[PDB]
Amino acid sequence: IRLGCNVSAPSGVLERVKELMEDYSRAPDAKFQQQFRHLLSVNFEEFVAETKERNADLDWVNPKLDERLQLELGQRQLEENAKKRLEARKKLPTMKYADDIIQAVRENQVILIVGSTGCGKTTQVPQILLDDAISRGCASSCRIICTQPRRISAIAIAEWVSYERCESLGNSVGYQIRLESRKARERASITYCTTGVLLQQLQSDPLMHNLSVLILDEIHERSVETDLLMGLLKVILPHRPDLKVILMSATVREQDFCDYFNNCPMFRIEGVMFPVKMLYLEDVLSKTNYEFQKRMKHEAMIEPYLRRIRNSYDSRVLDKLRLPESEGCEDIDFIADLVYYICENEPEGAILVFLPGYDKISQLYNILDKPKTSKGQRWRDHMAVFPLHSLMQSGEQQAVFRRPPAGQRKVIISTIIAETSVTIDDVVYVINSGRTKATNYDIETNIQSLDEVWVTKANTQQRRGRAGRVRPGICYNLFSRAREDRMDDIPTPEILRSKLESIILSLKLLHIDDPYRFLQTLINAPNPEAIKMGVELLKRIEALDQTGTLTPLGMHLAKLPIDPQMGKMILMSALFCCLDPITSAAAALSFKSPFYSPLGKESRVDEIKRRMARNMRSDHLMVHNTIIAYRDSRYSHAERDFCYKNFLSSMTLQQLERMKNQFSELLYNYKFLASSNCKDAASNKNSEKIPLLRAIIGAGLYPNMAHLRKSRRAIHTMATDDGRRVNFHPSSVNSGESGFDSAYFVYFQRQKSTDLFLLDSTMVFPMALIIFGDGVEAGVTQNTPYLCVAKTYYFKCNRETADVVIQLRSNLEKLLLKKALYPAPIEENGYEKQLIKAIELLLSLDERL
DNA sequence: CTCTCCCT
């Protein structure tokens, strides 16, 4: 036990904390509390009965609207204005199977439609079933929900299907994503929505009574949500015989889902794509004749292969395959040569280069842009070269989509983002490195890492398809087919890679109280060690009690669309009147930072963040400062130049501001805020007290703590509270700085790459962790009285301050408990405000003087 | 001294 700095408080401050605490203890209605005790008192089939009565609207049909919609669909098939496409929709493969699809849906609760790119299943199946129900005179009983993984998919498909009905968005076709919607009409309608939207609507309608048809699309990508959703359908569908489910999948281990749902009817629908030829490293090197210069294992893999292909390739190319450098992206000059090769031979078309991450996208960009070779010098002026990365601006502009200037060849250097999420349509050539970056979770070390790995067979399959979009393509794989046969079928499904605290809490609102029993039902069961690690986190932040049951605060956290830790941070910000900054922090950790990382500009983007951090040693208040400055630039009509000068995405900032408005609207409806405007003066009376903002941020990121011991840009000897040595991620404002007021930090995410890095952090003060943390005891270790937090960090503290802090933590726990059970805004002159004022007083002693 | 990427 090595004691830290002295946290004792002046006697004058302790007396007034005492005057204030015992004002608070002199104190003497609830719809939320009755909702909470009802949920805990009912068993599961009481739960089923109650939610059936409460969501009954589809029990009502509208015969006159049935017959009217049936009658202008009958006639409005008789123009030629919506026909040109009915004969154009008939040219899509899915339409040939209309009646079999219709008939299979009537005879089966669940069917599966499997099909490759271009088959038309997403756009055509919803209309096939909708137009059938209208024609049978069932229009008003038909409400179809179609889920998509990505937001932009939902809007684009909705807009395109509505074009296909000669309607504007909002009649028979709509979309719903989070924070934006164009809703269809209530009945005889199709809604495209993101999977999360549907999961959140499950909290009000846990048996899906408010739709007649559920279409789950792209289940083969095995996102958490569709895996959860199929898991829940096994619970829901027994109580919903009228409900129709259509699963939709690419041809990627499709049989997993057929098996998972008994064995249900499976339709296979042929795609529409032009042929794309696949070449491997042998083939590429036999064409380019490039020469390399400047464990094995690998040799165990390659030599059997080179003996089986001995007579199909020249010996000198098979010898290059014995170098480990020859496969993947380890030699960027090799990729550069094959780019130059495609520009010389081969017809007109764009090159799509798949590389795992930012670092070597940078290297190939610089080699094409500042060429080392005469061949490169040659081709420099005839290429328009686009890096494509989530942290880069290229996808936010339209150049990378349009066709190049005449005489110029387009070269796209991208991450995995161009496999599905972003799509360039004039690509005829894919150079596939076979390498990506992926996150994996070591359950035993509690270390998250980001490592470069080989892609899966499904990845290359989809990357191959990216070339066949306008015209027959070529896919160059920078690895041998021996490496291909050592690749996994599909990536490890993300629910085995994921923190489960949010999911487990959400399942309590669906009256699924055993996460063990339920998660074991998934197609891929998560490690039960991860399930109690999630349970244990929820117990610590007190969303569950020790027996495992939902607490009143846990019910609030499950109803907030954010991870429970930051939801807790968000509610504290209401109680403590700093709503705007803390919601700024939560939305950014919950989504992403507004800053780009444009090629070559890092030293300069590093310097913008340090100026936006306003020397506050917090990545989280850096984002809030960024948002304050962004609002000022709109209020100044300077928005474009502001974003330019500071390498900011105005589209990221706009979405952060709507999440902030949404957190503010939810907290208002839950009766925690007097106003729904997250900028409201009453909600922000402390938003400029920096020590108080460190306290609320720490309350949410607790227990992720780190301690620095070090003086010198500077190097850092720092370690997390589990003893592991960490460093600030070089993208953090805190990396390399010296002279912190405090050696203590909280962080949202630690990650291993070159080193174990803290990706975001706020400098915190010991009294703040002590008040809002746990594991707090007073004692004596040498002959020095101490106060500790988490039974880890011990601070010199005199008995009078120790005792008052311990009394203070007790009434805070009583206060939080009643705000959870009886939500009200803290009234500014009442008794609860006096214990708020006690805490601000103590925290304000750490102000930078 | 470094950054796979969806989503309520």
CSV table of C-alpha atoms in Angstrom, one decimal, chain A residues 216-581:
chain,number,residue,atom,x,y,z
A,216,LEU,CA,-35.3,-10.0,-41.8
A,217,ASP,CA,-32.8,-9.2,-44.5
A,218,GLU,CA,-29.1,-9.9,-44.7
A,219,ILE,CA,-29.1,-12.4,-41.8
A,220,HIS,CA,-25.9,-14.0,-43.3
A,221,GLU,CA,-23.8,-11.1,-42.0
A,222,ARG,CA,-24.6,-12.4,-38.5
A,223,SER,CA,-24.9,-9.1,-36.8
A,224,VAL,CA,-25.8,-9.1,-33.1
A,225,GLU,CA,-29.3,-7.8,-33.8
A,226,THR,CA,-30.5,-10.3,-36.3
A,227,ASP,CA,-29.1,-13.1,-34.2
A,228,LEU,CA,-30.9,-11.7,-31.2
A,229,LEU,CA,-34.0,-11.2,-33.3
A,230,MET,CA,-34.1,-14.8,-34.5
A,231,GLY,CA,-33.4,-15.8,-30.9
A,232,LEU,CA,-36.5,-13.9,-29.8
A,233,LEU,CA,-38.7,-15.2,-32.6
A,234,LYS,CA,-38.3,-18.6,-31.1
A,235,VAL,CA,-39.9,-17.2,-28.0
A,236,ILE,CA,-42.4,-14.9,-29.8
A,237,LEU,CA,-43.8,-17.1,-32.6
A,238,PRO,CA,-45.4,-19.7,-30.3
A,239,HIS,CA,-47.7,-16.9,-29.1
A,240,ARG,CA,-48.2,-15.3,-32.6
A,241,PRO,CA,-49.6,-17.9,-35.0
A,242,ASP,CA,-50.9,-15.2,-37.4
A,243,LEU,CA,-47.4,-13.6,-37.6
A,244,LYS,CA,-45.5,-14.2,-40.9
A,245,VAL,CA,-41.7,-14.2,-40.9
A,246,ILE,CA,-39.6,-14.2,-44.1
A,247,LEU,CA,-35.8,-14.6,-43.5
A,248,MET,CA,-33.6,-13.3,-46.3
A,249,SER,CA,-30.0,-14.3,-46.8
A,250,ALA,CA,-27.1,-14.2,-49.3
A,251,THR,CA,-25.7,-17.6,-50.3
A,252,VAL,CA,-23.4,-17.7,-47.4
A,253,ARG,CA,-23.9,-20.6,-45.0
A,254,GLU,CA,-27.6,-20.2,-45.7
A,255,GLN,CA,-28.3,-23.7,-44.3
A,256,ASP,CA,-27.5,-22.5,-40.8
A,257,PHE,CA,-30.8,-20.5,-40.7
A,258,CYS,CA,-32.8,-23.3,-42.4
A,259,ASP,CA,-31.6,-25.7,-39.7
A,260,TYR,CA,-32.1,-23.0,-37.0
A,261,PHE,CA,-35.8,-22.7,-37.8
A,262,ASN,CA,-36.9,-26.4,-37.7
A,263,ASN,CA,-36.3,-27.0,-41.4
A,264,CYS,CA,-38.4,-24.3,-43.2
A,265,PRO,CA,-39.1,-23.8,-47.0
A,266,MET,CA,-36.0,-22.3,-48.6
A,267,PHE,CA,-36.2,-20.5,-52.0
A,268,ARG,CA,-33.0,-19.9,-54.0
A,269,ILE,CA,-33.1,-17.0,-56.4
A,270,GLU,CA,-30.4,-16.5,-58.9
A,271,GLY,CA,-28.5,-13.1,-58.9
A,272,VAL,CA,-28.0,-10.6,-61.7
A,273,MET,CA,-24.3,-9.8,-62.1
A,274,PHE,CA,-21.8,-10.0,-64.8
A,275,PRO,CA,-19.1,-12.7,-64.6
A,276,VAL,CA,-16.0,-11.9,-62.6
A,277,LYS,CA,-12.8,-13.9,-63.0
A,278,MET,CA,-10.8,-14.9,-60.0
A,279,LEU,CA,-7.0,-14.9,-60.2
A,280,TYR,CA,-4.7,-16.0,-57.4
A,281,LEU,CA,-1.2,-15.0,-56.5
A,282,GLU,CA,0.3,-17.6,-58.9
A,283,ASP,CA,-1.8,-16.1,-61.7
A,284,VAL,CA,-1.0,-12.5,-60.9
A,285,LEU,CA,2.8,-13.2,-60.6
A,286,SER,CA,2.7,-15.2,-63.8
A,287,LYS,CA,1.2,-12.1,-65.5
A,288,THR,CA,3.2,-9.3,-63.8
A,289,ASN,CA,6.5,-11.2,-63.4
A,290,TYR,CA,7.2,-8.8,-60.5
A,291,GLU,CA,10.4,-9.5,-58.5
A,292,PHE,CA,10.6,-9.0,-54.7
A,293,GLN,CA,13.5,-7.4,-53.0
A,294,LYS,CA,15.0,-4.4,-51.0
A,295,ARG,CA,6.5,-18.7,-38.9
A,296,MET,CA,6.7,-21.4,-41.5
A,297,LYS,CA,4.1,-22.8,-41.1
A,298,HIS,CA,3.9,-20.7,-44.3
A,299,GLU,CA,6.3,-23.3,-45.8
A,300,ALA,CA,4.2,-26.1,-44.5
A,301,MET,CA,1.3,-24.6,-46.4
A,302,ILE,CA,2.9,-23.6,-49.7
A,303,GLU,CA,5.1,-26.6,-50.7
A,304,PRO,CA,2.3,-29.3,-51.0
A,305,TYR,CA,0.4,-26.7,-53.0
A,306,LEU,CA,3.3,-25.9,-55.3
A,307,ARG,CA,3.9,-29.5,-56.0
A,308,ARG,CA,0.2,-30.0,-57.0
A,309,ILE,CA,0.4,-27.0,-59.4
A,310,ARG,CA,4.0,-27.9,-60.6
A,311,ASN,CA,3.1,-28.3,-64.2
A,312,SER,CA,0.6,-25.4,-64.4
A,313,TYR,CA,3.1,-22.5,-63.8
A,314,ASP,CA,6.7,-21.7,-64.5
A,315,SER,CA,9.0,-22.7,-61.7
A,316,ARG,CA,10.2,-19.1,-61.1
A,317,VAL,CA,6.7,-17.9,-60.2
A,318,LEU,CA,6.1,-20.9,-57.9
A,319,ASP,CA,9.4,-20.0,-56.2
A,320,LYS,CA,8.1,-16.5,-55.4
A,321,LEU,CA,5.2,-18.2,-53.6
A,322,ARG,CA,7.6,-19.5,-51.0
A,323,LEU,CA,8.2,-16.0,-49.7
A,324,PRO,CA,5.8,-15.1,-46.9
A,325,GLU,CA,6.1,-11.5,-48.1
A,326,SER,CA,4.5,-12.5,-51.4
A,327,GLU,CA,1.0,-12.9,-50.1
A,328,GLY,CA,-1.2,-10.3,-48.4
A,329,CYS,CA,0.0,-6.6,-48.4
A,330,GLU,CA,3.5,-6.8,-46.8
A,331,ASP,CA,5.0,-5.5,-50.1
A,332,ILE,CA,3.1,-2.4,-51.2
A,333,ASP,CA,5.4,-2.0,-54.2
A,334,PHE,CA,4.0,-5.3,-55.5
A,335,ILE,CA,0.5,-4.0,-55.3
A,336,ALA,CA,1.7,-0.8,-57.0
A,337,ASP,CA,3.1,-2.8,-59.8
A,338,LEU,CA,-0.1,-4.7,-60.4
A,339,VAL,CA,-2.0,-1.3,-60.4
A,340,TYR,CA,0.4,-0.2,-63.1
A,341,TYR,CA,-0.1,-3.5,-64.9
A,342,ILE,CA,-3.9,-3.0,-65.1
A,343,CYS,CA,-3.5,0.6,-66.5
A,344,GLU,CA,-1.3,-0.7,-69.4
A,345,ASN,CA,-3.2,-3.8,-70.5
A,346,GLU,CA,-7.0,-4.4,-70.0
A,347,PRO,CA,-10.1,-2.4,-71.1
A,348,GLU,CA,-11.4,0.8,-69.5
A,349,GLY,CA,-12.4,0.5,-65.9
A,350,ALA,CA,-11.7,1.5,-62.3
A,351,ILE,CA,-9.5,-0.4,-59.8
A,352,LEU,CA,-10.7,-1.3,-56.3
A,353,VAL,CA,-7.8,-2.1,-54.0
A,354,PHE,CA,-8.8,-3.7,-50.7
A,355,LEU,CA,-6.2,-3.2,-47.9
A,356,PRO,CA,-6.8,-3.8,-44.2
A,357,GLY,CA,-6.4,-0.3,-42.7
A,358,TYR,CA,-5.3,3.3,-42.8
A,359,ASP,CA,-1.5,2.7,-42.5
A,360,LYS,CA,-0.9,0.9,-45.7
A,361,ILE,CA,-3.7,2.7,-47.6
A,362,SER,CA,-1.4,5.6,-46.8
A,363,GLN,CA,1.6,3.8,-48.2
A,364,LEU,CA,0.1,2.8,-51.5
A,365,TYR,CA,-1.4,6.3,-51.9
A,366,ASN,CA,2.1,7.8,-51.5
A,367,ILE,CA,3.7,5.4,-53.9
A,368,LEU,CA,1.1,6.1,-56.7
A,369,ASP,CA,1.2,9.8,-55.9
A,370,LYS,CA,5.0,10.2,-55.4
A,371,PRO,CA,6.4,7.3,-57.5
A,372,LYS,CA,9.7,5.6,-56.8
A,373,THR,CA,10.0,4.1,-60.3
A,374,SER,CA,10.0,5.2,-63.8
A,375,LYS,CA,6.9,3.1,-64.3
A,376,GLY,CA,5.3,5.0,-61.5
A,377,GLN,CA,6.5,8.4,-62.8
A,378,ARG,CA,4.8,7.4,-66.0
A,379,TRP,CA,1.4,6.6,-64.7
A,380,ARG,CA,1.1,9.3,-62.0
A,381,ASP,CA,-0.7,11.9,-64.2
A,382,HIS,CA,-3.1,9.3,-65.6
A,383,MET,CA,-4.6,8.1,-62.4
A,384,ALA,CA,-7.2,9.7,-60.1
A,385,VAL,CA,-6.5,8.0,-56.8
A,386,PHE,CA,-9.0,7.9,-53.9
A,387,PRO,CA,-8.3,6.6,-50.4
A,388,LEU,CA,-11.5,5.2,-48.9
A,389,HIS,CA,-11.7,4.9,-45.1
A,390,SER,CA,-14.3,5.7,-42.4
A,391,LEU,CA,-11.9,8.4,-40.9
A,392,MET,CA,-11.4,10.0,-44.3
A,393,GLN,CA,-13.6,12.4,-46.2
A,394,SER,CA,-13.6,10.6,-49.6
A,395,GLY,CA,-17.0,8.9,-49.0
A,396,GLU,CA,-18.6,12.3,-47.9
A,397,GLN,CA,-17.8,13.8,-51.4
A,398,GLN,CA,-19.1,12.6,-54.8
A,399,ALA,CA,-15.9,12.5,-56.8
A,400,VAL,CA,-15.1,9.0,-55.8
A,401,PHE,CA,-18.5,7.9,-57.2
A,402,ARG,CA,-18.4,9.8,-60.5
A,403,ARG,CA,-16.4,8.6,-63.5
A,404,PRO,CA,-12.8,9.9,-63.9
A,405,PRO,CA,-11.7,12.7,-66.3
A,406,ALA,CA,-11.1,11.4,-69.8
A,407,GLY,CA,-7.7,9.7,-70.1
A,408,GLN,CA,-7.6,9.1,-66.4
A,409,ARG,CA,-8.0,5.8,-64.7
A,410,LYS,CA,-9.7,5.7,-61.3
A,411,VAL,CA,-7.9,3.9,-58.5
A,412,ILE,CA,-9.8,3.3,-55.2
A,413,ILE,CA,-7.6,2.3,-52.2
A,414,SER,CA,-10.1,1.1,-49.6
A,415,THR,CA,-10.7,-0.8,-46.3
A,416,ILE,CA,-13.4,-3.4,-46.0
A,417,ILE,CA,-15.9,-0.5,-46.1
A,418,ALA,CA,-16.1,-0.9,-49.9
A,419,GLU,CA,-17.2,-4.5,-49.5
A,420,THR,CA,-20.9,-3.6,-48.7
A,421,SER,CA,-21.2,-0.4,-46.7
A,422,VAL,CA,-19.9,1.9,-49.6
A,423,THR,CA,-20.4,0.9,-53.2
A,424,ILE,CA,-18.6,2.3,-56.3
A,425,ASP,CA,-20.4,1.3,-59.5
A,426,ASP,CA,-17.8,1.7,-62.4
A,427,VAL,CA,-15.4,-0.8,-60.8
A,428,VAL,CA,-14.2,-3.5,-63.2
A,429,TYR,CA,-11.2,-4.6,-61.2
A,430,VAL,CA,-10.7,-5.7,-57.6
A,431,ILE,CA,-7.2,-6.1,-56.2
A,432,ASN,CA,-8.0,-8.2,-53.0
A,433,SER,CA,-5.1,-8.3,-50.5
A,434,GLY,CA,-6.9,-10.8,-48.4
A,435,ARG,CA,-6.1,-8.9,-45.3
A,436,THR,CA,-8.3,-6.9,-42.9
A,437,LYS,CA,-8.3,-5.6,-39.4
A,438,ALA,CA,-10.7,-7.1,-36.9
A,439,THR,CA,-11.5,-6.8,-33.2
A,440,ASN,CA,-11.2,-9.9,-30.9
A,441,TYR,CA,-11.9,-10.3,-27.3
A,442,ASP,CA,-9.6,-12.3,-25.0
A,443,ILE,CA,-12.0,-13.3,-22.2
A,444,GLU,CA,-9.1,-14.3,-19.9
A,445,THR,CA,-6.9,-11.1,-20.0
A,446,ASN,CA,-9.8,-8.7,-20.5
A,447,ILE,CA,-7.8,-7.1,-23.2
A,448,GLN,CA,-9.4,-6.0,-26.5
A,449,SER,CA,-7.1,-6.0,-29.5
A,450,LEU,CA,-7.3,-4.9,-33.1
A,451,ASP,CA,-5.2,-7.3,-35.2
A,452,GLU,CA,-4.6,-7.7,-38.9
A,453,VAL,CA,-6.0,-11.0,-40.1
A,454,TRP,CA,-6.8,-12.9,-43.3
A,455,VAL,CA,-10.4,-12.4,-44.5
A,456,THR,CA,-12.9,-15.2,-44.8
A,457,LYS,CA,-14.2,-17.0,-47.9
A,458,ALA,CA,-17.3,-14.9,-47.7
A,459,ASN,CA,-15.3,-11.7,-47.7
A,460,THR,CA,-13.5,-12.5,-50.9
A,461,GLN,CA,-16.7,-13.8,-52.5
A,462,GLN,CA,-18.3,-10.5,-51.9
A,463,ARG,CA,-15.2,-8.6,-53.0
A,464,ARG,CA,-15.3,-10.6,-56.2
A,465,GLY,CA,-18.9,-9.4,-56.8
A,466,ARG,CA,-17.9,-5.8,-56.5
A,467,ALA,CA,-16.3,-6.0,-60.0
A,468,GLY,CA,-19.3,-7.4,-61.9
A,469,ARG,CA,-21.5,-4.3,-61.5
A,470,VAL,CA,-21.5,-2.7,-65.0
A,471,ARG,CA,-19.6,-5.2,-67.0
A,472,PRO,CA,-17.4,-8.4,-66.7
A,473,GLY,CA,-14.6,-8.0,-64.2
A,474,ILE,CA,-11.4,-9.5,-62.9
A,475,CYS,CA,-10.6,-10.1,-59.2
A,476,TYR,CA,-6.8,-10.4,-58.4
A,477,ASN,CA,-6.3,-12.1,-55.1
A,478,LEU,CA,-2.9,-11.4,-53.6
A,479,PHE,CA,-2.8,-14.8,-51.9
A,480,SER,CA,-2.5,-18.4,-53.2
A,481,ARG,CA,-5.4,-20.9,-53.3
A,482,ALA,CA,-3.6,-22.8,-50.6
A,483,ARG,CA,-4.1,-19.8,-48.3
A,484,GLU,CA,-7.8,-19.7,-49.4
A,485,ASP,CA,-8.3,-23.2,-48.2
A,486,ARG,CA,-7.0,-22.2,-44.8
A,487,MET,CA,-9.5,-19.3,-44.6
A,488,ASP,CA,-12.6,-19.6,-42.4
A,489,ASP,CA,-16.0,-19.7,-44.0
A,490,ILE,CA,-17.4,-16.6,-42.4
A,491,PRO,CA,-16.1,-14.1,-39.8
A,492,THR,CA,-16.6,-15.0,-36.2
A,493,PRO,CA,-20.2,-13.8,-35.5
A,494,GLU,CA,-20.1,-10.5,-33.6
A,495,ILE,CA,-22.2,-11.7,-30.6
A,496,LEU,CA,-19.2,-13.9,-29.6
A,497,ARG,CA,-17.0,-10.8,-29.9
A,498,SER,CA,-19.3,-8.4,-27.9
A,499,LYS,CA,-19.9,-6.9,-24.4
A,500,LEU,CA,-23.2,-8.2,-23.3
A,501,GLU,CA,-24.3,-5.8,-20.5
A,502,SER,CA,-26.6,-3.8,-22.8
A,503,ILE,CA,-28.3,-6.9,-24.2
A,504,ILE,CA,-28.9,-8.6,-20.9
A,505,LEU,CA,-30.4,-5.4,-19.5
A,506,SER,CA,-32.7,-5.0,-22.5
A,507,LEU,CA,-33.8,-8.6,-22.1
A,508,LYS,CA,-35.1,-7.8,-18.7
A,509,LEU,CA,-37.7,-5.4,-20.2
A,510,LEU,CA,-38.9,-8.2,-22.5
A,511,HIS,CA,-39.4,-10.3,-19.3
A,512,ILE,CA,-36.6,-12.6,-20.3
A,513,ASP,CA,-34.9,-12.8,-16.9
A,514,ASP,CA,-32.5,-15.7,-17.4
A,515,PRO,CA,-29.8,-14.5,-19.9
A,516,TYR,CA,-28.0,-17.9,-19.4
A,517,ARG,CA,-31.0,-19.8,-20.6
A,518,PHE,CA,-31.9,-17.4,-23.4
A,519,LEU,CA,-28.5,-16.6,-24.9
A,520,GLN,CA,-27.8,-20.4,-25.0
A,521,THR,CA,-30.6,-20.6,-27.6
A,522,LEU,CA,-28.9,-18.4,-30.1
A,523,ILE,CA,-27.5,-20.0,-33.3
A,524,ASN,CA,-24.1,-19.3,-31.7
A,525,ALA,CA,-24.2,-19.3,-27.9
A,526,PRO,CA,-21.9,-16.7,-26.3
A,527,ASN,CA,-19.4,-17.8,-23.7
A,528,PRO,CA,-21.3,-18.0,-20.4
A,529,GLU,CA,-18.2,-16.4,-18.8
A,530,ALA,CA,-19.1,-13.3,-20.9
A,531,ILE,CA,-22.7,-13.6,-19.7
A,532,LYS,CA,-21.8,-13.2,-15.9
A,533,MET,CA,-19.1,-10.7,-16.8
A,534,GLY,CA,-22.0,-8.7,-18.2
A,535,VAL,CA,-24.2,-9.5,-15.3
A,536,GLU,CA,-21.4,-8.5,-12.9
A,537,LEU,CA,-20.9,-5.1,-14.5
A,538,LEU,CA,-24.7,-4.5,-14.3
A,539,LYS,CA,-24.6,-5.3,-10.6
A,540,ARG,CA,-21.7,-3.0,-10.0
A,541,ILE,CA,-23.4,0.0,-11.6
A,542,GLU,CA,-26.5,-1.2,-9.7
A,543,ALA,CA,-28.9,-1.8,-12.7
A,544,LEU,CA,-29.4,-5.2,-11.1
A,545,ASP,CA,-29.4,-6.0,-7.4
A,546,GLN,CA,-27.4,-8.8,-5.9
A,547,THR,CA,-30.0,-11.5,-6.6
A,548,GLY,CA,-29.9,-10.5,-10.2
A,549,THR,CA,-33.3,-8.6,-10.5
A,550,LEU,CA,-33.8,-5.4,-12.4
A,551,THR,CA,-33.6,-2.2,-10.1
A,552,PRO,CA,-35.6,0.9,-10.8
A,553,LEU,CA,-32.4,2.5,-12.2
A,554,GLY,CA,-31.9,-0.5,-14.4
A,555,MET,CA,-35.3,0.0,-15.9
A,556,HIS,CA,-34.4,3.6,-16.8
A,557,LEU,CA,-31.1,2.4,-18.3
A,558,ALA,CA,-32.7,-0.3,-20.4
A,559,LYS,CA,-35.1,2.3,-21.9
A,560,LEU,CA,-32.3,4.6,-22.9
A,561,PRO,CA,-30.8,3.9,-26.4
A,562,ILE,CA,-27.2,3.8,-25.2
A,563,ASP,CA,-25.0,1.5,-23.2
A,564,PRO,CA,-25.9,1.4,-19.5
A,565,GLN,CA,-22.7,3.1,-18.3
A,566,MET,CA,-23.2,6.2,-20.4
A,567,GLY,CA,-27.0,6.2,-19.7
A,568,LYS,CA,-26.0,6.4,-16.1
A,569,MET,CA,-23.7,9.2,-16.9
A,570,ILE,CA,-26.6,10.9,-18.8
A,571,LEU,CA,-29.0,10.7,-15.9
A,572,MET,CA,-26.4,12.0,-13.4
A,573,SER,CA,-26.1,15.0,-15.8
A,574,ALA,CA,-29.8,15.8,-15.2
A,575,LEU,CA,-29.4,15.4,-11.4
A,576,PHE,CA,-26.2,17.5,-11.4
A,577,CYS,CA,-27.4,20.2,-14.0
A,578,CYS,CA,-24.8,19.8,-16.7
A,579,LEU,CA,-26.7,18.2,-19.4
A,580,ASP,CA,-25.2,19.6,-22.6
A,581,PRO,CA,-21.6,18.7,-22.1
